[PDB]
Symmetry: D3
Subunit: 311 residues, 6 copies
């Protein structure tokens, strides 16, 4: 019975009022690998120490390893579906970016994430180089920067566990997951110039009432229509924890999309439908106001596996 | 009876869990001045609209105008003590930076400050250029990044009103104030290498217990000793709302110092004592781990005066 | 593994600060049946949409179908214990009232229940006719209008699951339940004229201390004595969520009794003991100040069964 | 220094999550007048007793007396502006309804208002007859049933005191106020069929962002334009505490408008502008979906005056 | 304008969930007096330091000096009404106990009071000897150990200020107050054996409903009747903050009565009415189940006076 | 499936803001045993009644029986590891104290524990004699009186269940546990005189940051090093709920250590390592400032076993 990381529990508990996405790369050399492998076993103790002081803080941290990082750190067989993120070249472009270790830190207060990230980076020292560091926050009542409520159709409780945690398909990694991260920059002026009814149709839900739309009223290019896919005749869901972020001073507004799954094929299919179009040419209008500049895939191993690594 | 801005009330209410310091400069041309003057009268309506939706949000915004901005916008006589911030050249350097308008936004949640700053910048458009935009947050239990509780000796209720709000010295501006803003970048590795007793003596208070030290145990260069000054034989206090800020990914850690007063002479004297030393050469050791890179002085007029400007 | 509705979880979580009981009847005609069957599959999506926006809202909705409604909607075999509620003619009368669909909506705030009920009724349109619509609220510290704490002896966690959810007795409906609803109108003047010790003995517990009474001090007609019944030599419990309601202007005060079980025989036996008396003539004095005007029985199917209906 | 009732303090404190408007008429006979006059002096003790038990409950009650009630109860000179509410016959009709005593009860929980109203009605007994009894609740984030945030432009702190409390114009009643109550029933289907931009223009603010509109974009019949009036060249504000209410089962949806002032002439002018039109024929479109069925004017005396009445 | 201590503000704010009453005596010798006089000026700094860390903690501390302590510490003229507490010998006995300094510490959490008391005692060292140290806590919903709600008839806001703070009767001490402290030990078995109606009549209010009783139903020996006294034909109120306390293990149950006034004559008259009887022989039945073992009177000077003492 | 008591659930839920440890002895005679056996079956009903009224109160009570109490009450075979606590005579002394029944009461408020303890003692009457009664409270942010965060390394969720609840080693008592209680009195003056770095090394963690220390920096006598033991090559954890307590007036400061386990051998080994030393002579320095005066071992049976006892 391998203990799994806090992947779906924080979402269901619904306490993440602040988050930090930290994508770092391992510097060349064996010493950096040794330092990272040593810090792997103490990550859990750091998590407990940093978040025990602030009760009801909901502090959690998910560590993910990409294909290159896993090749550099653990040379044993890799998971079945672990591979470099595939770029998509359709009506829009989804680039692939370097990354070896992903730290997704969530807490009910920003200071907890700040302290945990500072401790992690200080312990890692010069062994890693920070590639991306995004500080996301909950915007109003679970709304994103486009004004629409996000996260409604996420699976809850047992459904989330069945959708994210890997079963017996890859026993040697039972309890792991696959995470896909992307960063979108929004064109708020263009979105705001769009009439409210057009946004109504594009998203496929309602703005204020957050109630869905009837199948007779949702066009073929609705966001929730293109992202609805099925396997073996049954609909399969993924866990999303998109977080708004930005800096007003530089005029930067964006959303950090993060998706957990037991199979990255589902998320890749959803990305293909959104970018290439299903059928081709029928792309999602959301990409007309949102630009993707960062995208990567990581593997999330079990907590016991992390605690079982010897330097 | 001129209505004063929310200068001391937010501090006493103690609800600022997040803040944004936005220092912008007015672009050359009369059109930019006209746009700023028009937005001046609608700032209050924007504040009310943005912060009424989130009850117990504690949203407040203080707008300050520097000497150059006041000269460009209102050509009538200026306040008595409004002048360009004086740089200090002692054992350390405190630079002076350009700035025309200061927006100090405070709220119990980050999203309110985000929305207010975005609305203000969108309304201002191209008339202003953003010089500095710092997002500060409350760190643990009112502690700064150095680990010491900050804000203990702030005046409360009537004392704060008497210390910040201008009396009859400049009737034509009764209800205004002077605000001095600085940005400090910390060297946390050097501070952490310092023994706990040395930090104990340098700050002049205790770390955990936050209790003061006896006058027989505080050296002449204690931080709370050098910052204690008197006028006409009576001690005079200032209102401080320093806010920690930073980005772990770039390794940036700092504190945004903000000080309100009825007379900037007090804050300038405190800065002279800290940097030059009282007596000279006996500087505060805090500057040995903190570097000042931004410093400016602004004037905060009354709410009625802001509402009374005609474009 | 059929997913069960939120029957016992809201009670154990203890967040229902407001509730709406909506008993409606299906209008004659096949079109109304088709509309209800279509709305059955979208009820869950409506629930999620309406209650995701208000975090920690605890919004839940239980839909129940009576014998006539089940006969009109699904013509396949009915559950084993689904039948028209039996009226009781003893010292008091418990009438039976028409009803086809029951909506029990619970939330921590009244507005969520209001929005959900409005959406449900708007979607149903003219296909249904509202028979009863009662808005109940939590009165002080879980007290009913008679001044006594109610809900103390409810089963918690696993006991509630074993008492409410149907096991293998009716496999084809595993995960369902039976719900019995009644509406009582109180005579508060008569109850208040009764001495505190007489109410002490009638209820069988204490008023303020909410502690029980010794078996030597509880008469044979104590409320908690007559409602304590056993099956096969073992005591069996039922889940109750009685909610006070009323309108001061019309002088209307009452309690909405709702009871969930895996077998309605237990609740019917409890009703027989309370009304007819055990032994006959030894009725509960609570009925001397409370009048029952509405009573109905419904069947609560599983969430998966509701989602699996095709129009 | 006459102590004033909690007229503006509850609004500024912003804790009214539930309210009850109870309009009753005094039955003919001297005994009813004597009973009401006796209960007048014990109303404050009842208020304290009922609301002291639930800390942070924010329980308050405002008692108002109409012209007829004041004539029947106190035969001394009446306030200057106390008169029967004037009906308005323009494009829409605003009826006048009987009423002698008004009880506006507000609390953070519904049960407190329930208990206070029940106690008041029980103490009054048969001396009064209930004419209207409306239970209002806060809908989502201070939004009314039309989906727009209401209460943004209300005066706060000293402005509210100067707008509601009577000064020296009628010394003998210093500290009193005038309250105008109306009940509106909404046609939600017609409002919802209206496009979002048309509602945008009709209300004069924005829906989600709750930010105002520029004077170049608000038509002459915007709701906030017609309700903006001035006295002696200065804009004068009134205090509004409109509360949504309704029953889904009967399909009843409405808003209870309540307005406090030091002079009812302002509210009457606002009503004339909304109904007759300014200029005539340019009425507010809100009345096209809202029907007024109840409207009355009451006088709110000081707490000391209420405590000083001898039976 | 002398600043007054937090005497009435904590009660009106209603945040005291825990309190510590510490009555200590000054050891003989001039050194103890010097140490106490030195700690007097740093008490405020200690208060701020100890309670700034726990936001919304509501930490306050009132220091009072008795007649002997004032004679030993300050040899200048004493307040007009400062004298040794007078023992009362009627049907019951109210003893007088030694005491020089009184510390009434209040906070929303017990740990704050613990820390403040520990710091005060550590700073005082051997200069003082602890006579009494009682840890009181709020019992349920502002109820005392007898089951009745206490504190309902306390003056609020301006009335409390006028009742507690000394006016111009003793200018040299404007802003001070007089505090009377007593400790009562309850006989809960005897009180519980008393019927609920007899307790109803003895207290003079209701138990659950906390509503008063009509003057025709309250006997002459009701607790709220004997404690209602008038000066110059006008009723005068006092501020009470009675706190339940006890230890179950030793079977000790009691109430710590504390009363603030601008004139101790009112509290002494109330004590005479309760113990001797008004008329004599008509004593309060509360003393039949409560025994007084400690009683003392102290003077509370202004905060500025405390800060102005030089060792 | 025997239902287990609330042993690990309250700790994981993290709501114990107040606790009472009540160690009592059974008086000689069969009547006392009969009374205790009768109260055993009603303890659960008392718990539910006392803690249902205060929602989110987190009230729980654990009843434990020592070897002598179990011999006097139930004469059937005892658990495998139930025995009298063994005193330890090394560099320090850990005494053994009499005790028959242990009541560990926990709640989010002190009043709930007070009421429950009072009810339990009143029901027990003269059948038991109170030996120890300690009222503990949470000190600041889960810190003990020594200033270090305590409870960080406690097992959570499934690990706690596996560490505390007895498996199949003693089937007849499956679901029980063993609890070891000790009372330590602290010498705060000696601890405070110790430099912060020496406390840093003695505890083995950090004070403010609550982060652990590297194995190269923790000496052999670190507290967390000596208390880390293994069974069969695997580390085994125990559940600790130490609670600070004391009385400032008497200068009494201490910590009540409580430890739950499926095997008391682990706790006895930890005590031997701390007191005797591992290797001998290398004792924990914590005992140099803390004195143990009370120590006892009890057995905690299942809830079903308690409910199944017949008087
Ligand atoms: C800036 C980027 C995006 C934004 C602002 C956005 C926004 C939204 C919103 C508002 C909804 C409806 C609320 C809900 O269903 O919970 C939604 C639905 C959804 N989106 Fe996105 N989305 C973005 C990108 C993506 C991407 C890249 C994916 C997958 C690779 C994705 C997958 C989904 C899924 C699975 C749903 C649920 C629809 C359903 O279950 O019917 N989204 N999105
Ligand atoms: C206006 C109607 C009623 C009121 C005010 C009322 C009130 C109460 C109260 C105050 C208690 C004790 C608190 C508690 O046990 O949690 C209780 C117990 C109980 N009542 Fe009711 N009751 C009503 C009707 C009913 C009905 C109609 C039934 C069943 C058909 C019922 C079944 C029970 C049960 C099972 C218990 C638990 C007793 C035990 O477990 O020993 N009640 N009731
Ligand atoms: C164990 C001791 C006492 C207990 C349990 C107790 C309890 C109560 C209670 C329950 C009330 C009604 C609640 C309220 O009026 O707020 C009350 C009223 C009052 N008591 Fe006490 N009391 C005690 C001793 C005293 C003493 C010694 C005094 C004065 C020296 C006093 C002065 C008052 C006053 C002024 C009132 C307000 C009555 C009114 O305003 O009409 N009490 N007491
Ligand atoms: C006054 C007495 C004691 C105090 C103040 C104290 C304090 C502490 C502190 C601050 C920690 C580190 C925080 C943590 O690990 O959660 C700790 C660790 C621990 N202590 Fe204690 N302790 C005391 C007595 C004991 C005793 C008597 C035992 C066992 C019989 C014990 C067993 C443990 C254990 C198991 C740990 C966890 C260490 C680890 O998992 O590596 N403690 N103690």
């Amino acid at each position: 019975c391998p203990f799994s990381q806090s992947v779906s529990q924080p979402v269901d508990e619904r306490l993440t009022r602040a988050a930090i996405f930290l994508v770092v790369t391992i510097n060349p050399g064996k010493a950096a690998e040794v330092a990272v492998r040593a810090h792997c076993s103490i990550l859990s103790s750091l998590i407990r120490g940093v978040g025990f002081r602030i009760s009801d803080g909901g502090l959690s941290c998910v560590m993910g390893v990409s294909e290159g990082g896993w090749e550099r750190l653990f040379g044993d067989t890799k998971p079945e579906y672990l591979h470099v993120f595939r770029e998509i070249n359709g009506v829009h472009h989804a680039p692939s970016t370097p990354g070896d270790l992903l730290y997704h830190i969530r807490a009910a207060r920003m200071d907890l994430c700040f302290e945990l990230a500072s401790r992690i980076l200080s312990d890692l020292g010069n062994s890693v180089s920070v590639v991306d560091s995004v500080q996301g926050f909950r915007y109003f009542d679970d709304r994103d920067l486009l004004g629409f409520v996000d996260g409604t159709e996420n699976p809850v409780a047992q459904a989330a566990v069945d959708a994210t945690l890997i079963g017996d398909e890859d026993m040697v990694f039972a309890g792991g997951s696959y995470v896909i991260v992307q960063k979108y920059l929004h064109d708020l002026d263009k979105w705001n110039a769009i009439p409210v009814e057009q946004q109504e149709k594009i998203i496929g839900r309602e703005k204020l009432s957050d109630i869905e739309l009837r199948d007779a009223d949702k066009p073929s290019y609705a966001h929730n229509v293109l992202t609805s896919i099925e396997e073996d005749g049954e609909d399969v869901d993924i866990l999303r924890d998109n977080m708004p972020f930005g800096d007003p001073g530089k005029g930067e507004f964006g959303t950090y999309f993060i998706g957990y799954s037991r199979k990255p094929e589902r998320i890749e299919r959803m990305l293909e439908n959104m970018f290439i179009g299903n059928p081709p040419g029928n792309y999602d209008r959301i990409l007309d106001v949102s630009r993707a500049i960062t995208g990567t895939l990581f593997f999330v191993p079990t907590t016991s596996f992390l605690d079982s690594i010897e330097p």
